[PDB]
Design a protein around this motif. Structure first.
Motif, short mmCIF file in Angstrom:
data_model
loop_
_atom_site.label_atom_id
_atom_site.label_comp_id
_atom_site.label_asym_id
_atom_site.label_seq_id
_atom_site.Cartn_x
_atom_site.Cartn_y
_atom_site.Cartn_z
N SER A 8 51.59 37.19 35.43
CA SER A 8 50.66 36.35 34.42
C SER A 8 49.25 36.09 34.93
N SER A 9 49.02 36.01 36.17
CA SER A 9 47.79 35.92 36.64
C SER A 9 46.87 37.04 36.40
N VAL A 10 47.44 38.42 36.48
CA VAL A 10 46.76 39.43 36.10
C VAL A 10 46.42 39.49 34.67
N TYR A 11 47.46 39.24 33.75
CA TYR A 11 47.22 39.07 32.16
C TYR A 11 46.10 37.95 31.94
N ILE A 333 52.20 48.48 15.35
CA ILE A 333 53.34 49.48 15.45
C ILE A 333 54.31 49.16 16.40
N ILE A 334 54.07 48.19 17.29
CA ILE A 334 55.19 47.54 18.06
C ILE A 334 56.02 46.64 17.27
N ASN A 335 55.24 45.81 16.54
CA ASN A 335 55.96 44.78 15.52
C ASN A 335 56.85 45.85 14.53
N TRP A 350 55.02 44.27 29.83
CA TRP A 350 53.76 44.77 30.29
C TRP A 350 53.03 45.41 28.89
N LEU A 351 54.01 46.21 28.24
CA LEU A 351 53.29 47.06 27.21
C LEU A 351 52.90 45.94 26.02
N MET A 352 53.67 45.06 25.68
CA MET A 352 53.16 43.97 24.78
C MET A 352 51.99 43.45 25.23
N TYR A 353 51.50 43.00 26.43
CA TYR A 353 50.48 42.40 26.74
C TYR A 353 49.23 43.34 26.96
N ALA A 355 49.08 45.58 24.73
CA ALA A 355 48.77 45.90 23.43
C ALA A 355 47.90 44.71 22.90
N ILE A 356 48.12 43.52 23.41
CA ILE A 356 47.53 42.33 23.10
C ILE A 356 46.01 42.27 23.60
N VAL A 357 45.93 42.75 24.92
CA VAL A 357 44.70 42.82 25.53
C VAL A 357 43.79 43.84 24.69
N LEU A 358 44.41 44.93 24.49
CA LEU A 358 43.52 46.04 23.57
C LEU A 358 43.09 45.51 22.32
N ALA A 359 43.90 44.68 21.57
CA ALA A 359 43.36 44.11 20.30
C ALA A 359 42.43 43.40 20.72
N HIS A 360 42.35 42.37 21.55
CA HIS A 360 41.09 41.56 21.96
C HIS A 360 39.79 42.34 22.36
N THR A 361 40.11 43.21 23.00
CA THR A 361 39.06 44.36 23.64
C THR A 361 38.05 44.71 22.20
N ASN A 362 38.47 44.77 21.20
CA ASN A 362 37.94 45.14 20.05
C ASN A 362 36.51 44.18 19.67
N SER A 363 36.98 42.75 20.34
CA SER A 363 35.85 42.00 20.19
C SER A 363 34.63 42.12 21.08
#
Ligand SMILES: CC(C)CCC[C@@H](C)[C@H]1CC[C@H]2[C@@H]3CC=C4C[C@@H](O)CC[C@]4(C)[C@H]3CC[C@]12C
Ligand SMILES: CC(C)CCC[C@@H](C)[C@H]1CC[C@H]2[C@@H]3CC=C4C[C@@H](O)CC[C@]4(C)[C@H]3CC[C@]12C
Ligand SMILES: CC(C)CCC[C@@H](C)[C@H]1CC[C@H]2[C@@H]3CC=C4C[C@@H](O)CC[C@]4(C)[C@H]3CC[C@]12C
Ligand SMILES: CC(C)CCC[C@@H](C)[C@H]1CC[C@H]2[C@@H]3CC=C4C[C@@H](O)CC[C@]4(C)[C@H]3CC[C@]12C
Ligand SMILES: CCCCCCCC/C=C/CCCCCCCC(=O)OC[C@H](O)CO
Ligand SMILES: CCCCCCCC/C=C\CCCCCCCC(=O)OC[C@@H](O)CO
Ligand SMILES: CCCCCCCC/C=C\CCCCCCCC(=O)OC[C@@H](O)CO
Ligand SMILES: CCCCCCCC/C=C\CCCCCCCC(=O)OC[C@H](O)CO
Ligand SMILES: CCCCCCCC/C=C\CCCCCCCC(=O)OC[C@H](O)CO
Ligand SMILES: CCCCCCCC/C=C\CCCCCCCC(=O)OC[C@H](O)CO
Ligand SMILES: CN1CCN(CCNc2nc(N)n3nc(-c4ccco4)nc3n2)CC1
Ligand SMILES: CCCCCCCC/C=C/CCCCCCCC(=O)O
Ligand SMILES: CCCCCCCC/C=C\CCCCCCCC(=O)O
Ligand SMILES: CCCCCCCC/C=C\CCCCCCCC(=O)O
Ligand SMILES: CCCCCCCC/C=C\CCCCCCCC(=O)O
Ligand SMILES: CCCCCCCC/C=C\CCCCCCCC(=O)O
Ligand SMILES: CCCCCCCC/C=C\CCCCCCCC(=O)O
Ligand SMILES: CCCCCCCC/C=C\CCCCCCCC(=O)O
Ligand SMILES: CCCCCCCC/C=C\CCCCCCCC(=O)O
Ligand SMILES: CCCCCCCC/C=C\CCCCCCCC(=O)O
Ligand SMILES: CCCCCCCC/C=C\CCCCCCCC(=O)O
Ligand SMILES: CCCCCCCC/C=C\CCCCCCCC(=O)O
Ligand SMILES: CCCCCCCC/C=C\CCCCCCCC(=O)O
Ligand SMILES: CCCCCCCC/C=C\CCCCCCCC(=O)O
Ligand SMILES: CCCCCCCC/C=C\CCCCCCCC(=O)O
Ligand SMILES: CCCCCCCC/C=C\CCCCCCCC(=O)O
Ligand code: NA
Length: 387
Positions: A8-11, A333-335, A350-353, A355-363
């Protein structure tokens, strides 16, 4: 089972790093448009709305995502808002991206009536409407399409949640049929495919208009050779009539005067040709070369230069839309796998987060695209930083 706070600390650390970069870069975008009058066009008003959505990703959506990753006890509808607000920001981004593509198509397809059709006042109203629609789409689960009526009571009891509370977890409260059919398919995938269709029309119109300019330039030079190698006045007349129609077709102060000379000189040679004066018509048609080298060729190069700049701007807009798709598609796609294949094991934590981080990186990415591809943004960025 390693202590969950370690992963969690890394995420969380990565999310906070993304939030800082999303805020800094997109504040710089809004600051640049505010300061530079050359950046204050209708296209960049949607750019600002897009940057505002990405600022809110860093200010609100990322803190919300960090909070919901803990599964903390919460009233289910309050949990829903934390879970779904990022869908509002994503939907607003989609509306801005679609508006930018449409704006670029109008500018290249009907540039004569662009300024009369696409105005800043109308753009601001469209932006306001699209933000209202983004809240209605993104917060549709709060209208009843949720799992709050069927809470996971064993999970809530295990975490010591109070009566009326649930463990706030995304896939526990947000229905996956909403996420796949409504959010992804209807509200994300279809507009992205519409954007693809718009950009195909933009680049096809660019290729066609560039070909039309080259066709008029070749027809101008070809019929000049026809007049020189002609023997009778009728052949000179046929070539001059095609030049005059093409001259008025390419015409659609220094620009107007250049075509006024060209059409006038064509009419002069035409009148001599209608009188049977072949030699005098050919000599008058040779005077067209002076107008071509001093006026017509300059208009061809400038019209070509304008179209190439429109292609470059349309590609910059298409890159932004493509990067949005690349950053958000893995999570969608995961959904789809979770929803359509219940026999498939759930995608790992780890893959869920990731994908979440990657979506946020678009900002974070759009300010870099503007800096690398738009000189006016890049120069204004440097002035803001140096000052
Ligand atoms: C104008 C902006 C800056 C204000 C931001 C307000 C945000 C942070 C507020 C508005 C509504 C709030 C939620 C409303 C209801 C609940 C249910 C409760 O059981 C736990 C907290 C939780 C989930 C709240 C978390 C914080 C929250 C999302
Ligand atoms: C600028 C516009 C968008 C105004 C923003 C105000 C929004 C973010 C605020 C205003 C009032 C808030 C709500 C007030 C009360 C509740 C009831 C609770 O059981 C769940 C959260 C919920 C539903 C809050 C969610 C966030 C909320 C809707
Ligand atoms: C848009 C571009 C980047 C393509 C993205 C492809 C990604 C999102 C795809 C490619 C392979 C996919 C994985 C392939 C197999 C499985 C095993 C299954 O039990 C759960 C889903 C899971 C884990 C898939 C999740 C999504 C996945 C990682
Ligand atoms: C429209 C194109 C360009 C992009 C969108 C492609 C999406 C919708 C496609 C690509 C791969 C597809 C998945 C590939 C494999 C499976 C496993 C199967 O047991 C159920 C459906 C499921 C989970 C598919 C659902 C839809 C899917 C996610
Ligand atoms: C708890 C959540 C609270 C968060 C609240 C979120 C509200 C959405 C904000 C949108 C700002 C829009 C950005 C402004 C972009 C408009 C562009 C513009 O100003 O154009 C001027 C006009 O075109 C010249 O005539
Ligand atoms: C910087 C702000 C720090 C926010 C602190 C957030 C706490 C994270 C947490 O407790 O995770 C619980 C489970 O997910 C497993 O750890
Ligand atoms: C500045 C703009 C606002 C940004 C705020 C970000 C904070 C994210 C929301 C934080 C949400 C708080 C979580 C909570 O309430 O836990 C306690 C419950 O378990 C009690 O039952
Ligand atoms: C809320 C998030 C930040 C929203 C930022 C608000 C947008 C700033 C306005 C702007 O930068 O644009 C000015 C406009 O272009 C003049 O014509
Ligand atoms: C400018 C805005 C400041 C907001 C900061 C977010 C900090 C969020 C603080 C969340 C604390 C939640 C908590 O303490 O919950 C403990 C537990 O629920 C019972 O012991
Ligand atoms: C745009 C593309 C849309 C295709 C998306 C369609 C993907 C849905 C297919 C999954 C499916 O129908 O699964 C049936 C079920 O697994 C039986 O047990
Ligand atoms: C057992 N697992 C443990 C980890 N859980 C992670 C829950 N977080 C989460 N989960 C999902 N599916 N999405 N989808 C999205 C999204 C937003 C826009 C499009 O898609 N966000 C999400 N956030 C899932 C369960
Ligand atoms: C979630 C689905 C939402 C569907 C709702 C359909 C209605 C939305 C229509 C929007 C077009 C807005 C144009 C009219 C603005 C006029 C405002 C005024 O009266 O001054
Ligand atoms: C982008 C750069 C690399 C991304 C690395 C951070 C993302 C995932 C690694 C986290 C490992 C496990 C995640 C735990 C999530 C959780 O506990 O809620
Ligand atoms: C960047 C600042 C580092 C914050 C690290 C997260 C630890 C908080 C936690 O997991 O409890
Ligand atoms: C992404 C990162 C770009 C950040 C550039 C740093 C300058 C910030 C200036 C500002 O906040 O206005
Ligand atoms: C966190 C939210 C911060 C949003 C950043 C947006 C900044 C860009 C434009 C806002 C208008 C600027 C207002 C100050 C004007 C001062 C001046 O004109 O010199
Ligand atoms: C410029 C303003 C930006 C706002 C800063 C917000 C930074 C805080 C980040 C995340 C808050 C996470 C709260 C954790 C939830 C509670 C955990 C639990 O109760 O189990
Ligand atoms: C405004 C900037 C944000 C200010 C402070 C950040 C501190 C966040 C504290 C989260 C506490 C988490 C917890 O107690 O479980
Ligand atoms: C549908 C939601 C409606 C929202 C009303 C927003 C007000 C916008 C009116 C201006 C429209 C325009 O000038 O094109
Ligand atoms: C940005 C302008 C605002 C437009 C908002 C339009 C869409 C609003 C949608 C949902 C709001 C629902 C709030 C939920 C009420 C509390 C529910 C409960 O107590 O159980
Ligand atoms: C066309 C866009 C218009 C904006 C949306 C229209 C306004 C929506 C009205 C009311 C939403 C109320 C929120 C629901 C409260 C609790 C519902 C529940 O228990 O699920
Ligand atoms: C572009 C349109 C995107 C997707 C079309 C949706 C078709 C999905 C059919 C669902 C299959 C099923 O019910 O099991
Ligand atoms: C859903 C598939 C991805 C669609 C993204 C379209 C954005 C523009 C891309 C290419 C223009 C050529
Ligand atoms: C490197 C970033 C991620 C790369 C590829 C994604 C594929 C991961 C799939 C692992 C299988 C998950 C499972 O065991 O269910
Ligand atoms: C831009 C595309 C993103 C892909 C880049 C990959 C970088 C991050 C990849 C992995 C970090 C997450 C941890 C992976 C191993 C964890 C295995 C486990 O804990 O079981
Ligand atoms: C963890 C933060 C990752 C930041 C995403 C990178 C976006 C742009 C990268 C490089 C531009 C030079
Ligand atoms: Na965005």
């Amino acid at each position: 089972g390693a202590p969950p706070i370690m992963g969690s600390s890394v995420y969380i650390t990565v999310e906070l790093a993304i939030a800082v970069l999303a805020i800094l870069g997109n504040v710089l975008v809004c600051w640049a448009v505010w300061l530079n009058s050359n950046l204050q066009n209708v296209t960049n008003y949607f750019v600002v709305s897009l940057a505002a959505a990405d600022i809110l990703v860093g200010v609100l959506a990322i803190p919300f995502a960090i909070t919901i990753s803990t599964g903390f006890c919460a009233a289910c509808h309050g949990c829903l808002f934390i879970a779904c607000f990022v869908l509002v920001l994503a939907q607003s981004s989609i509306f801005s991206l679609l508006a930018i593509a449409i704006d670029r198509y109008i500018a290249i397809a009907i540039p004569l009536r662009y300024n009369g059709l696409v105005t800043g006042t109308r753009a601001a109203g469209i932006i306001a409407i699209c933000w209202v629609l983004s809240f209605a789409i993104g917060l549709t689960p709060m209208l009843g399409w949720n799992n709050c009526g069927q809470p996971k009571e064993g999970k809530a009891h295990s975490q010591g949640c109070g009566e009326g509370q649930v463990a706030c977890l995304f896939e526990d409260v947000v229905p996956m049929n909403y996420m796949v059919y409504f959010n992804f398919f209807a509200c994300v995938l279809v507009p992205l495919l519409l954007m693809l269709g718009v950009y195909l029309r933009i680049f096809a119109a660019a290729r066609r208009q560039l070909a039309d300019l080259e066709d008029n330039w070749e027809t101008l030079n070809d019929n000049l050779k026809v007049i020189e190698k002609a023997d009778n006045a009728a052949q000179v007349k046929d070539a001059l009539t095609k030049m005059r129609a093409a001259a008025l077709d390419a015409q659609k102060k220094d620009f107007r005067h250049g075509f006024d000379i060209l059409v006038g000189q064509i009419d002069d040679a035409l009148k001599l040709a209608n009188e049977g004066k072949v030699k005098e018509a050919q000599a008058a048609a040779e005077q067209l070369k002076t107008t071509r080298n001093a006026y017509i060729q300059k208009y061809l190069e400038r019209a070509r230069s304008t179209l190439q700049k429109e292609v470059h701007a349309a590609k910059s807009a298409a890159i932004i839309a493509g990067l949005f798709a690349l950053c958000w598609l893995p999570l969608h796609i995961i959904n789809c796998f979770t929803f359509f294949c219940p026999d498939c094991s759930h995608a790992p934590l780890w893959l869920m987060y990731l994908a979440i981080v990657l979506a946020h990186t678009n900002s974070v990415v759009n300010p870099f695209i503007y800096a690398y591809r738009i000189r006016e943004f890049r120069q204004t960025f440097r002035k803001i930083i140096r000052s």
